[PDB]
Amino acid sequence: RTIKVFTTVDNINLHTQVVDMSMTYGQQFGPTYLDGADVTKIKPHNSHEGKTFYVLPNDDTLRVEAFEYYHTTDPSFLGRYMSALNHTKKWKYPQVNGLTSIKWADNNCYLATALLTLQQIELKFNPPALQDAYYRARAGEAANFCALILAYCNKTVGELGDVRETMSYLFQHANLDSCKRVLNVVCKTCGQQQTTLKGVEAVMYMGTLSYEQFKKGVQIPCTCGKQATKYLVQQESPFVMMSAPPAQYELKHGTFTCASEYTGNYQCGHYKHITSKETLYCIDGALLTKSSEYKGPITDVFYKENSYTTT
Numbered sequence: 561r562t563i564k565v566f567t568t569v570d571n572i573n574l575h576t577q578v579v580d581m582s583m584t585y586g587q588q589f590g591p592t593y594l595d596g597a598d599v600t601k602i603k604p605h606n607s608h609e610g611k612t613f614y615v616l617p618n619d620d621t622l623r624v625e626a627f628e629y630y631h632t633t634d635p636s637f638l639g640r641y642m643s644a645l646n647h648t649k650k651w652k653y654p655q656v657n658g659l660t661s662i663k664w665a666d667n668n669c670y671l672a673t674a675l676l677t678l679q680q681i682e683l684k685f686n687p688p689a690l691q692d693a694y695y696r697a698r699a700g701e702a703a704n705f706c707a708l709i710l711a712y713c714n715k716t717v718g719e720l721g722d723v724r725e726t727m728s729y730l731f732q733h734a735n736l737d738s739c740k741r742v743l744n745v746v747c748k749t750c751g752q753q754q755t756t757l758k759g760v761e762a763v764m765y766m767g768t769l770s771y772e773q774f775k776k777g778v779q780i781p782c783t784c785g786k787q788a789t790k791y792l793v794q795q796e797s798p799f800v801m802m803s804a805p806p807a808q809y810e811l812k813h814g815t816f817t818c819a820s821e822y823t824g825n826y827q828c829g830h831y832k833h834i835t836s837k838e839t840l841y842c843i844d845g846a847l848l849t850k851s852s853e854y855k856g857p858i859t860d861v862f863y864k865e866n867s868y869t870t871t
């Protein structure tokens with residue numbers, strides 16, 4: 561005796577199966593997951609009739625379908641993803657100032673910061689798995705998106721995480737082709753060395769929190785040997801993310817889009833989100849806090865942009 565279930569790798573192309581109800585899912589298909597739960601080892605239950613199961617791909621049809629949804633051939637991915645989903649599906653995603661945050665759980669403050677940031681910057685993702693899961697997170701259903709961010713970043717539920725680190729990972733999976741940053745460097749010896757940057761390196765700088773400061777200039781070690789200073793000529797990008805190791809910093813309403821607060825030490829600290837709406841909101845999972853100024857330990861500041869030229 562049998563029942564009728566659907567299997568997929570992407571959740572777009574379903575593939576109806578007839579399952580022997582006395583063998584396990586593992587023997588009939590392969591490693592198999594329902595709603596993120598591993599079900600490799602259980603026998604088809606009667607309520608499982610008419611439900612979608614994620615499976616690894618055997619067929620090259622499914623191997624191509626998985627690539628075109630996830631842009632990864634990596635065999636471990638779909639499992640690492642389903643593993644996360646099983647947890648993130650249990651997380652609570654409260655609206656907090658019409659933003660989808662995550663109630664703190666299974667160590668997720670950095671994810672909640674990254675997620676809140678990702679709803680305030682104009683980001684087009686390349687893996688359809690991600691672009692779809694995002695759109696859904698925007699609308700409050702954010703389990704899937706968090707699971708993928710974890711999988712795509714090689715992190716797991718419980719692991720601690722840098723926001724700078726988690727963003728660059730995602731920027732790398734985002735169309736930032738038309739992003740261009742022209743630098744200029746001047747040592748009084750080397751001469752006048754003008755670099756161009758495209759893509760992810762165009763929209764991140766580790767060094768100062770201050771977009772203003774970068775435009776004026778910041779001192780560097782330089783090509784020839786020693787003493788030189790580098791300043792932003794041009795920046796065509798829809799945003800830039802200025803990072804630097806946690807200082808104390810005054811955030812003023814209207815000078816910046818949003819920021820990452822980091823209390824504590826390297827790799828054993830707690831993150832909060834500062835966003836500049838009518839006032840400065842500070843978001844800590846499900847806890848909103850507003851304030852006209854904000855001095856605290858800032859490490860990442862996102863600025864909105866499209867085209868800037870120097871003088």
Ligand SMILES: *[C@H](CC(=O)OC)C(=O)NNC(=O)CCc1ccccc1C(=O)N[C@H](C)c1cccc2ccccc12
Pocket residue numbers: 667668669670719720721722723725804805806822824825826827828829830831859
């Ligand atoms: C939240 C923890 C929680 O949920 O508790 C309620 C969480 O996951 N926090 N993340 C971390 O603690 C992990 C921090 C981390 C991980 C890897 C690499 C760097 C970092 C990190 O500490 N980043 C911070 C911002 C940092 C970056 C660069 C320099 C520097 C210098 C001094 C302190 C901190 C940093």
Ligand SMILES: [Zn+2]
Pocket residue numbers: 631686687733
């Ligand atoms: Zn890709």
Ligand SMILES: [Zn+2]
Pocket residue numbers: 747749750751782783784785786787788
């Ligand atoms: Zn030099």
Ligand SMILES: [Zn+2]
Pocket residue numbers: 828
């Ligand atoms: Zn600790």
